[PDB]
Amino acid sequence: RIIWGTNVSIQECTTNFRNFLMSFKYKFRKILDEREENTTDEELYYIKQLNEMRELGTSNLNLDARNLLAYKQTEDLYHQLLNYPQE
Amino acid sequence: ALPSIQLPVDYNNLFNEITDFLVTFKQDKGPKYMAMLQKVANRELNSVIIDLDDILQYQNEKFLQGDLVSAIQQNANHFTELFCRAIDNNMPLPTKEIDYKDDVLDVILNQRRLRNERMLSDRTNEIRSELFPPNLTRRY
């Protein structure tokens, strides 16, 4: 569904974002950064945070935009964020 | 009373003056008007500074072939009205290619315009069988 005010369609964004939240790893960040490597062999970072929050009920998920940026096929969202935060 | 005192200034004659007053000029070699309207339609510029030297040069050329300043000495703003609205009337469209994620407020207002245009050519047509102000499309 296209938005009348942002023309940023929902379904594609949510679909990519979902497996984004499941494909996420520390390494993407490391490659862009170029820092020396383990992070316990790069466990899934988002499910880490998500499980921890679910157990802690924080219901608030901090996030560094550059992380979402450093992952393939998300830069679209990475910029739409800077451009359509309200939605 | 309610007078209507005729003065030598006018807009319809100034309208025709503007119609002839188009891009066409020599040094301004491609006229700087043309390339700069490209540039602003290539979206790397918004301030199209229109000096007064080339104005009097265009006047001199038109006179040797066949006053604007004295006209802008009172209002100077009805000129910004006609002049700009005609730069809209004479705006190079296909200057360069277009994207959807190359900007903001240029793809979005085009979306609005053209989508409400589809919805109008559909809804008023179903009834059969608002006016977007030029400011909305200035971008300079």
Residue pair A16/A24 in contact (Cβ under 8 Å)? The answer is: no
Q: Phi and psi dihedrals of A20, rounded to 5?
A: -60, -45
Look at A7 and B107 and tell me if their CB atoms are within 8 Å: yes
PDB resolution in Å: 3.9
Q: How far apart are CA A66 and CA A6, in angstroms?
A: 23
**HSE-up of residue B114 (Cα within 13 Å, Cβ side):** 7
Place of tokens 């009337």: B89
Number of A–B residue contacts, CB under 8 Å? 13
Residue pair B19/B86 in contact (Cβ under 8 Å)? The answer is: yes
- 22-81 in A: which are within 8 Å (CB) of B? 76, 79
Residues 6+ apart with CB under 8 A from A49: A61
Best CA proximity match to A83, nearest among A64, A67, A65: A65
Cβ contacts (< 8 Å) between A4 and chain B: which residues?
112, 115
Experimental method: cryo-EM
List the domain boundaries for chain A.
Answer: 1-87
Going by the DSSP 8-state scheme, the letter that residue B24 receives in this structure is: -
Q: Which of A1, A2, A4 is the best mutation test for B, with the most CBs of B within 10 A?
A: A4
Alpha carbon B120 to its chain centroid, in Å, reads 26
Residue pair A73/A22 in contact (Cβ under 8 Å)? The answer is: no
Per the DSSP assignment, residues forming a β-bridge with A44 are A25
Q: How far apart are CA B15 and CA B79, in angstroms?
A: 9
Alpha carbon B85 to its chain centroid, in Å, reads 4
